[PDB]
Amino acid sequence: LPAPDDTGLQAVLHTALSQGAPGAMVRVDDNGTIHQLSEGVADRATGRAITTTDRFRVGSVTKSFSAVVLLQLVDEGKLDLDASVNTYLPGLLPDDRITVRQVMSHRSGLYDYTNDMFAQTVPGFESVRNKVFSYQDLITLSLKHGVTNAPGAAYSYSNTNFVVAGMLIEKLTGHSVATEYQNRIFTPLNLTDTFYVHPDTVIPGTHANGYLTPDEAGGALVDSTEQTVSWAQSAGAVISSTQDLDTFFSALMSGQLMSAAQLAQMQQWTTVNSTQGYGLGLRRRDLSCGISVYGHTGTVQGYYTYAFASKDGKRSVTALANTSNNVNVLNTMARTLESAFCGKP
Numbered sequence: 001l002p003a004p005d006d007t008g009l010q011a012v013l014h015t016a017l018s019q020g021a022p023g024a025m026v027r028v029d030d031n032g033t034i035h036q037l038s039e040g041v042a043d044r045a046t047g048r049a050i051t052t053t054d055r056f057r058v059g060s061v062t063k064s065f066s067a068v069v070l071l072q073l074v075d076e077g078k079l080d081l082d083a084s085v086n087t088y089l090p091g092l093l094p095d096d097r098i099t100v101r102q103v104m105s106h107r108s109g110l111y112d113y114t115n116d117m118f119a120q121t122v123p124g125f126e127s128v129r130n131k132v133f134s135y136q137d138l139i140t141l142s143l144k145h146g147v148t149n150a151p152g153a154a155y156s157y158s159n160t161n162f163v164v165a166g167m168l169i170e171k172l173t174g175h176s177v178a179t180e181y182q183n184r185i186f187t188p189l190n191l192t193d194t195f196y197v198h199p200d201t202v203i204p205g206t207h208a209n210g211y212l213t214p215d216e217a218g219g220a221l222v223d224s225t226e227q228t229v230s231w232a233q234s235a236g237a238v239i240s241s242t243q244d245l246d247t248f249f250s251a252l253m254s255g256q257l258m259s260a261a262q263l264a265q266m267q268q269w270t271t272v273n274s275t276q277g278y279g280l281g282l283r284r285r286d287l288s289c290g291i292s293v294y295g296h297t298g299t300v301q302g303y304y305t306y307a308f309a310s311k312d313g314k315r316s317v318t319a320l321a322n323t324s325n326n327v328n329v330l331n332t333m334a335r336t337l338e339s340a341f342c343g344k345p
């Protein structure tokens, strides 16, 4: 790989601040040599600086954690990716043909209930932030709508799919998702900054606050740090750090979290666009310099994450900006992957 470009990374973070991120940061683990940069504030009211050791909400990166658990269940003979969801969760879905593999790859057709919840960004946050939902509650909200496509027919990202994932984990194991993440992932990898505390609203230890950008241009930011994340659960509620997400995706890609056979299944790509694919709770991004990287993005109120690794896991990158609902920031933060993997022009 080319050398990571720290001057380029610095420029990305500075641009993200200029676009409305209170703070932005990135950590690269380059085969044992660390790169770490941060700019701005973890708490914009107190002025406390952001740092790459601050814990944060990883949002939809959680899907990769849920996928690893499910794929280990496949390895153990407890789950068949081509079985119907309804074989394991009788009567859950309207269509018996929807399979586990389809759910994990966003090919199920299940309507994304969050389109109802977050039609208006800040009011929607205020509606959900202090609610506790069951998994079934969220599935019922989806099922108020028809499916959006036939089983397996089309990629359409939906949080509902990884709500199903959590229900499957809990049914098949008899344990909570927190227990399964701890025993299968957090403890074996020694992820000391990584937690699943749902429905607790506190982020343990020193953390970046999250700042939700309102829908009205120029509007005052809303502190969105403390919420249950119950609207997402196994689709979005993990807390982590840049170091720990780097460890996680490096361990995944290097073969440490499941059999070779199941990692290969995880990397069967469904086309998203001409430079992106979706596997089983895993994303592929094709970079300008002809490198692909593997991992997941995260969005949750007040936090944007990118966490990606090279194919052999030897280089991993995690970037965080502590805002959300700001597409300029979201797009800018993606440029960390260019600077970290492709290097200088």
Ligand SMILES: O=C(NCCS(=O)(=O)O)c1ccccc1
Binding pocket: 114, 115, 116, 118, 119, 121, 212, 299, 300, 301, 302, 324, 325, 326
């Ligand atoms: O994921 C959703 N919101 C949380 C991330 S952010 O805060 O909008 O950037 C979202 C989901 C469906 C419709 C609208 C929004």
